[PDB]
Amino acid sequence: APRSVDWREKGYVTPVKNQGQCGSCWAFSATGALEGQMFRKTGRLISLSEQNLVDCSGPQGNEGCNGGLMDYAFQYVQDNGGLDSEESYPYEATEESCKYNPKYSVANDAGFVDIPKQEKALMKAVATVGPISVAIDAGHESFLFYKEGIYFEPDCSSEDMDHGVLVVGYGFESTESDNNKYWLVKNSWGEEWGMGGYVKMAKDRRNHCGIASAASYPTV
């Protein structure tokens, strides 16, 4: 695989969004992955409606602002036959009744692919597919205050994840400890968090924060 990958430079990635005070990170992760795969297919980058997922994908198992899963979101898009654009179905950070309108659908998928729970497999997926939906253990103050560099939290869990995010690439930089590899991760806490909304998560360090434990992408 390549040593460095950044799908932002290929046009696959929309700007950083902000989920607010709603537990809807799974929806932002899913829209990020579907935005990348739709661009791969059509060459058009169109921001997708997280609110559509929050309001409408309960039957696939999601629970709105109380949590959900990216795979359930991909299943909704397939079962529902579409997903509205962000412009047409804007984000309100609160769960409401479903207002999906197929006339404004701009995305589709035919299912999803779950990646084996290994960072080596996640690397191959990122290198060949595009941005990948992942879940991480973000429940640490160090993550809130992250500003730059490679994020490494000794107390991070590799099994209990609480936050869906999007891997848009990976790379390296020289560090004091010579743990130099990172996943380039798009968060949904706005651009004031981290590095313009992004974090460099430790890569190849025992599946740090569980980044390879629940990785998937939609088939387009």
Side-chain angles (χ1 to χ4, degrees), residues 21-41:
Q21 291 312 294
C22 164
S24 58
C25 48
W26 56 270
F28 287 83
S29 175
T31 57
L34 196 55
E35 285 157 1
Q37 289 314 285
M38 289 298 306
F39 177 88
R40 190 197 185 180
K41 176 119 181 313

Side-chain angles (χ1 to χ4, degrees), residues 46-101:
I46 312 174
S47 187
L48 301 175
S49 169
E50 297 81 20
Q51 197 64 52
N52 198 160
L53 294 173
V54 163
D55 293 347
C56 302
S57 67
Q60 289 73 28
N62 288 325
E63 302 181 12
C65 287
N66 295 311
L69 284 164
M70 293 77 73
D71 275 8
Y72 291 170
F74 304 145
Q75 191 64 70
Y76 166 80
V77 178
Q78 182 180 19
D79 289 350
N80 185 65
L83 188 76
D84 285 338
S85 68
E86 186 87 83
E87 157 166 350
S88 70
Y89 198 157
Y91 185 66
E92 299 302 304
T94 65
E95 191 183 335
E96 293 291 64
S97 56
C98 185
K99 287 143 192 112
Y100 171 76
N101 185 335

Side-chain angles (χ1 to χ4, degrees), residues 1-5 7 121-132 167 169-170 183:
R3 167 86 166 156
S4 298
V5 176
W7 286 108
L122 176 61
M123 176 169 43
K124 295 159 172 153
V126 173
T128 57
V129 172
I132 306 292
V167 173
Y170 59 83
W183 302 106

Side-chain angles (χ1 to χ4, degrees), residues 92-154:
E92 299 302 304
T94 65
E95 191 183 335
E96 293 291 64
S97 56
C98 185
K99 287 143 192 112
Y100 171 76
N101 185 335
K103 204 182 209 303
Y104 294 94
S105 175
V106 299
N108 299 95
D109 72 52
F112 54 90
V113 168
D114 285 335
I115 300 159
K117 302 174 163 63
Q118 294 168 320
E119 289 187 273
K120 167 190 58 102
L122 176 61
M123 176 169 43
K124 295 159 172 153
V126 173
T128 57
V129 172
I132 306 292
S133 285
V134 301
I136 61 168
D137 174 14
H140 296 93
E141 162 181 275
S142 52
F143 195 78
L144 292 285
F145 300 163
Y146 168 83
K147 302 192 217 231
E148 71 166 5
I150 300 185
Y151 178 75
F152 180 83
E153 173 50 76

Side-chain angles (χ1 to χ4, degrees), residues 184-197:
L184 189 58
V185 171
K186 187 193 190 198
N187 196 5
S188 54
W189 289 356
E191 74 183 310
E192 298 83 8
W193 177 84
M195 182 186 68

